[PDB]
Amino acid sequence: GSVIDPSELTFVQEIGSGQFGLVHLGYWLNKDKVAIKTIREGAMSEEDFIEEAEVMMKLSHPKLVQLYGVCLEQAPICLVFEFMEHGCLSDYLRTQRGLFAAETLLGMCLDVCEGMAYLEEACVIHRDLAARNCLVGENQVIKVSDFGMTPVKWASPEVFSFSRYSSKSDVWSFGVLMWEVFSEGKIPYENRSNSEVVEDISTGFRLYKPRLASTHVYQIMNHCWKERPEDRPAFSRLLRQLAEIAESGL
């Protein structure tokens, strides 16, 4: 990827403050609107932070966020991404609650599923798929973000007990992301501790069917939440199941 000099960035407004660093609305070259992600000094190594960018810069799909480049010269170092006009999906769903047709919500799931099928094919495991790590562009296009990395509520049981990450553990997470979309940004397992969530899931409890989700939609969420990873569908199959409902039973 392209190396960006710090002098080429204009920081306009701080919009986010995470564990791994700050996010700012900015401009590159006084031209392109960008989301600038500054590393949090100490909280993560520059090597790892940079390697995430490298991974991302060679994964090209319409439903995966893109970078303009990396700014290494002046610490704190940063990644420079394209600016997604409507911010993160979890917040978007929350602020637009009541203004969504079920068809639109299904389309958002489809967008995320297309990007995840691409990642799955590339043998790239996300590890932290959640509405909070998806972004909203124009005409409500959803892109997957933060997908180049090396939250118990989105973790499959084999992940929360044994750290067995896989594309099928991403599918469990996608099921929870589907629940977030159809509940229009509710927090899954609200006010429950990790111990309680683990126990509930190990018991057979699953997130309740949201009002805007049809029976078929909920059947698909549940297939993502099967106990054994091998009983869950791959993203490339989920994509077509989700598309078939868009015609039939919403």
Q: Residues with catalytic annotation?
A: 128
Q: How far is the CB of 201 from ligand G7K (least distance, A)?
A: 26
| Angle, in degrees to the nearest 10, between helices 167-182 and 215-224 | 150
Residues that bind ligand G7K (CB under 6 A): 15-16, 18, 23, 35, 37, 65, 81, 83-88, 91-92, 95, 135, 145-146
Reference 97, options 180, 216, 215; nearest CA is 180
The DSSP bridge partners found for residue 21 are 39
Residue 22 among known ligand-binding residues: yes
Q: Of the two residues 109 and 136, which places its CB atom closer to ligand G7K in the complex? A: 136
Residue 21 among known ligand-binding residues: yes
Q: Of the two residues 81 and 235, which places its CB atom closer to ligand G7K in the complex? A: 81
Q: How far is the CB of 145 from ligand G7K (least distance, A)?
A: 4
Helix/strand/coil for 89: helix
CB-CB contact of 150 with 48 (8 Å): yes
Instruction: Write out the E strands in 83-131.
Output: none
Residue 17 among known ligand-binding residues: yes
Indicate the residue type of 190: E
Residue 23 among known ligand-binding residues: yes
Q: Of the two residues 154 and 218, which places its CB atom closer to ligand G7K in the complex? A: 154
Q: Which residue is nearest to ligand G7K (CB)?
A: 16
Calculated CA dihedral for residues 154, 160, 165, 169, nearest 10 degrees: -40
CB-CB contact of 79 with 23 (8 Å): no
Binding-site residues for ATP, please? 15-23, 37
